[PDB]
Ligand binder design. Sequence first.
Ligand SMILES: *[C@@H]1O[C@H](CO)[C@@H](O[C@@H]2O[C@H](CO)[C@@H](O[C@@H]3O[C@H](CO[C@@H]4O[C@H](CO[C@@H]5O[C@H](CO)[C@@H](O)[C@H](O)[C@@H]5O)[C@@H](O)[C@H](O[C@H]5O[C@H](CO)[C@@H](O)[C@H](O)[C@@H]5O)[C@@H]4O)[C@@H](O)[C@H](O[C@H]4O[C@H](CO)[C@@H](O)[C@H](O)[C@@H]4O[C@H]4O[C@H](CO)[C@@H](O)[C@H](O)[C@@H]4O)[C@@H]3O)[C@H](O)[C@H]2NC(C)=O)[C@H](O)[C@H]1NC(C)=O
Ligand SMILES: *[C@@H]1O[C@H](CO)[C@@H](O)[C@H](O)[C@H]1NC(C)=O
Ligand SMILES: *[C@@H]1O[C@H](CO)[C@@H](O)[C@H](O)[C@H]1NC(C)=O
Ligand SMILES: *[C@@H]1O[C@H](CO)[C@@H](O)[C@H](O)[C@H]1NC(C)=O
Ligand SMILES: *[C@@H]1O[C@H](CO)[C@@H](O)[C@H](O)[C@H]1NC(C)=O
Lengths: 66, 68, 440
Amino acid sequence: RFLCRSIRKLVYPKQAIQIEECEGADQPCDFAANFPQSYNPICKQHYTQQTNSFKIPSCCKCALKT
Amino acid sequence: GVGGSDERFLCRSIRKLVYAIQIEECEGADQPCDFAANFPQSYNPICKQHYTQQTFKIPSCCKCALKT
Amino acid sequence: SFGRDACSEMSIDGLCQCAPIMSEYEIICPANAENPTFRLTIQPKDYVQIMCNLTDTTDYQQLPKKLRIGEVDRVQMRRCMLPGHTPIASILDYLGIVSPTTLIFESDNLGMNITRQHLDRLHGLKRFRFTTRRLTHIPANLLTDMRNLSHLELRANIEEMPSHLFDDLENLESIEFGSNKLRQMPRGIFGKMPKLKQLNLWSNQLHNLTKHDFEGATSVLGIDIHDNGIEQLPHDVFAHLTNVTDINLSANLFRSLPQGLFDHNKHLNEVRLMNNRVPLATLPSRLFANQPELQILRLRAELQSLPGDLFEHSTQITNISLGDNLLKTLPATLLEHQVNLLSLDLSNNRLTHLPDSLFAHTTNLTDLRLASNQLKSVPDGIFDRLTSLQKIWLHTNPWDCSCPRIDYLSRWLNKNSQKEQGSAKCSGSGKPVRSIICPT
Ligand SMILES: *[C@@H]1O[C@H](CO)[C@@H](O[C@@H]2O[C@H](CO)[C@@H](O[C@@H]3O[C@H](CO[C@@H]4O[C@H](CO[C@@H]5O[C@H](CO)[C@@H](O)[C@H](O)[C@@H]5O)[C@@H](O)[C@H](O[C@H]5O[C@H](CO)[C@@H](O)[C@H](O)[C@@H]5O)[C@@H]4O)[C@@H](O)[C@H](O[C@H]4O[C@H](CO)[C@@H](O)[C@H](O)[C@@H]4O[C@H]4O[C@H](CO)[C@@H](O)[C@H](O)[C@@H]4O)[C@@H]3O)[C@H](O)[C@H]2NC(C)=O)[C@H](O)[C@H]1NC(C)=O
Ligand SMILES: *[C@@H]1O[C@H](CO)[C@@H](O)[C@H](O)[C@H]1NC(C)=O
Ligand SMILES: *[C@@H]1O[C@H](CO)[C@@H](O)[C@H](O)[C@H]1NC(C)=O
Ligand SMILES: *[C@@H]1O[C@H](CO)[C@@H](O)[C@H](O)[C@H]1NC(C)=O
Ligand SMILES: *[C@@H]1O[C@H](CO)[C@@H](O)[C@H](O)[C@H]1NC(C)=O
């Protein structure tokens, strides 16, 4: 179990790449009340660069916003 | 694995270029997540290495897995 | 001073390679190696990250030569050795870094203990983070002249924090001492910080907190003491936190709570007491009562009963998380004054019956979770005053689908079919409750 709901999908740089995308990006993480005070847990889409360069999604991570 | 000036993470990654494709690896594995002290006893928050598949595996993320 | 033009002028030289990665710039020293001593990441005007791979302090002699980074808000140093008996400001000076307001130093390869000198010249800093997995010693003079600090974070296996470390920290608003080994609060520390609002003391060893441990902390709004191995707490432990708004008492070892624990704390807005590591059978009388600002209550677990007095005259309560406890029933007057309640979670609790007057005044309730319990029935007209109801969870309950017992519920669920999340089913047969038709 992960804090952010994600989906595995294929992306196509213009060969295919299997990636992890947020089901709910910029939305709160699950277990949002389980974090220390003054941290706002938000699901964030992260990216990786491959080189023509391509911004390709990597994973959905729970970011603790201050 | 630098991050934004107003954000913290449960798991920290180290960025590296391999030959160019950017990889994100766990700062050692398999370590407990940070800011994970208020989860139920049954859960073991552990930092887990994520991979993206190319049409081979590429380490692309370090994520917190609440292991039961 | 650094940008698109500065990135191009490097590259081909063969000293340090600058490659643009999205909005940032990656600099590897020495150029082309799977063991670089310095891996820099820069996003102009915003931040710079220095990642060292050092064997000794003499390896700083192979830092990128010249380089003009200029105006930057944040400075992050990962895995770097403290530079002997020289300031950190000198490394920053050599890379041409001006006006940094945030300094983060994270390393398990310190080589020595941190000193007042390591922080020379950068006394105008507003944010400081020092993090290590090493057993360290923090000197009382470390933060001398840090009169501009607003946020302090120290995570270095600290057992005792020196009292004189908090002098000249007159503008501090935030403290993050999570994951240390603090056994006791440093004395008279809050008289020195009149602008302190956040106080994070989670994952420490503060087993014995008393009234005197927070003397002078009258401006504090949030106290997070979760995971501190606390078994007991005196009734006056928070008497001095007169402005406190959020209290986190989670992941502790309470078998009970004293009666007037939140007296003098009349500006409370949220209280968390989640994942208690031992059963906490009940709460004392009027624990969360006569609170004019209290809105959110997160309570878990092994709670077996609640007093009817629990939320008396706390009319502003909007969210109550009572899920995953062991409650068999609720007192009829428990939600008598919760006129502004929006959400109530009672799922996964072992509830066998509910009083008919429980939802008599919760006319603003929109979400009600009663799933995964031991309810066979609900009394007639129990949900009739829930005018604002939008969503209800009644599934995973052993509903007795006998007539006239199931009449009100099956009829109510047909009249409010859209509001039901999941499907409440009859025990044994497995037929949906709303598909049972009682006569007349
Ligand atoms: C305390 O507990 C309460 C529990 O209730 C918590 O508050 C809730 O928080 C939820 C967070 O998930 C909120 O849910 C969102 O609601 C969005 C709709 O807005 C709301 O609409 C209702 C409508 O009410 C009734 O509906 C009928 C029609 O059926 C209307 O005729 C009529 O209005 C009627 O009354 C309304 O009650 C809400 O009003 C409240 O909030 C507003 C502020 O917004 C405030 O001014 C007001 O006073 C009320 O307090 C509000 O208007 C809904 O759009 C969201 O879902 C969509 O987005 C998510 C992502 O965010 C997706 O994952 C979903 O799949 C949905 O996506 C669809 O829709 C979007 C937008 O149209 C599209 O872009 C997509 O393509 C897709 O089609 C979401 O469910 C909920 O509103 C809120 N409840 C209340 C009463 O406030 C509160 O968080 C708790 N606090 C704490 C600290 O825990
Ligand atoms: C640091 O350098 C050494 C060189 O011996 C290498 O073994 C190690 O993997 C490097 N560490 C990182 C994180 O690059
Ligand atoms: C800091 O000081 C303590 C006490 O003298 C010592 O045991 C520890 O090893 C020092 N830390 C480092 C990183 O050298
Ligand atoms: C809250 O703090 C301010 C000073 O920061 C003070 O003036 C005020 O009286 C305090 N409130 C209470 C209830 O003590
Ligand atoms: C909701 O709360 C208000 C203010 O407390 C109250 O006056 C009213 O009775 C409630 N609203 C409804 C629709 O019952």
